[PDB]
């Protein structure tokens, strides 16, 4: 499979999540995603084909993971935007007020601005701390997907938000949305990963 930020993958033939960013760990290829998407050793599939397994994750507390893929997968420095792509150029962290977009299998590519950092989400499983909040909308299934600036600076992976009854927060005004992501920086250093860039 071609690994691109935003695409769907399934976990143990049950749940769906979105790919965050292609990365490497020495000769190992992988992608970063949300920790709540799978447990260590869960099987990830893309288009019905096994692509790898969860190598590590932290959730709750934090919300991160990386899936180590088979050597047959093709890592790409790109994030899906409809039928087009955003090139990943690095991971400079944007400040409050910067514009940012996110990509995932449920709502596609949505943009907004970062509104707050170091937010705590109180999920049924336990608190997740240190999240960054944006007002781009998101839906069930977008978790793990890419958050990136139009300039290509990868910001983190989707964790959660104030989902409404229709499964997203897209039918409420930007001012009322809370869409949270896990910062990418700490995930790269925690697992010794390098981002694939182009």
């Amino acid at each position: 499979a071609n690994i691109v930020g935003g695409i769907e993958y399934s976990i143990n033939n049950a749940s769906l999540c979105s790919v965050g960013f292609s990365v490497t760990r020495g000769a190992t290829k992988g992608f970063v995603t949300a920790g709540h998407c799978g447990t260590v050793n869960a099987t990830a599939r893309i288009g019905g084909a096994v692509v790898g397994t969860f190598a590590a994750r932290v959730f709750p507390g934090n919300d991160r993971a990386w899936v180590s893929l088979t050597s047959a997968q093709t890592l790409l420095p790109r994030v899906a935007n409809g039928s087009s792509f955003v090139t990943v150029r690095g991971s400079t962290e944007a400040a409050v007020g910067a514009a940012v977009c996110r990509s995932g299998r449920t709502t596609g590519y949505q943009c907004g601005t970062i509104t707050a950092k170091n937010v705590t989400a109180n999920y049924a499983e336990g608190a997740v701390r240190g999240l960054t909040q944006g007002n781009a909308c998101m839906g069930r299934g977008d978790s793990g997907g890419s958050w990136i600036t139009s300039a290509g600076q990868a910001q983190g992976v989707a964790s959660g938000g104030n989902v409404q009854s229709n499964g997203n927060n897209c039918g409420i005004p930007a001012s009322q949305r809370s869409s949270l992501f896990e910062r990418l920086q700490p995930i790269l250093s925690q697992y010794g990963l390098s981002l694939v860039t182009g």
């Binding site: 949300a34 709540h36 989400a121 998101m138 069930r140 299934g141 978790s143 989707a158 964790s159 959660g160």
Partner: peptide, 4 residues
């Protein structure tokens, strides 16, 4: 808030 809920995960996703």
């Amino acid at each position: 808030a809920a995960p996703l």
